[PDB]
């Protein structure tokens, strides 16, 4: 609670919210960009690495990594329905 808002990249916040179930990404998506393999200005691998990464994208490789590193989660608490009443909420009624 030291900060009120953290501005950062969508994948990191989504994964943190998936793991740390006490944080939420709420603001609308903006400044769409991508993560890229940066290299030297004149490096021969550029065409080869681009072809390889696109080939990985088109086949069933990248989504596998997404499933095994990002998509997996323990809890999310994502539901538009009004909050379900829990035991700690109306425990005062049992106290009365």
């Amino acid at each position: 609670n030291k900060l009120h808002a953290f501005i950062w990249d969508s994948a990191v916040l989504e994964f943190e919210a998936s793991q740390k179930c006490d944080l939420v990404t709420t603001g609308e998506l903006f400044f769409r960009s991508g993560f890229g393999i940066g290299m030297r200005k004149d490096s021969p691998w550029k065409q080869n690495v681009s072809l390889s990464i696109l080939k990985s994208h088109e086949n069933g490789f990248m989504e596998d990594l997404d499933k095994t590193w990002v998509r997996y989660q323990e809890c999310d608490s994502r539901s538009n329905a009004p909050a379900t009443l829990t035991f700690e909420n109306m425990a005062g009624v049992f106290m009365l």
């Binding site: 009120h4 953290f6 990249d9 944080l23 990404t25 603001g27």
Partner: peptide
């Protein structure tokens, strides 16, 4: 070519209901 498309966004702390 990009390997993950994403964008900037906001993270906040969920105020858990304290009854």
């Amino acid at each position: 070519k990009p390997f993950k498309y994403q964008g900037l966004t906001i993270l906040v702390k969920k105020e858990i209901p304290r009854s």
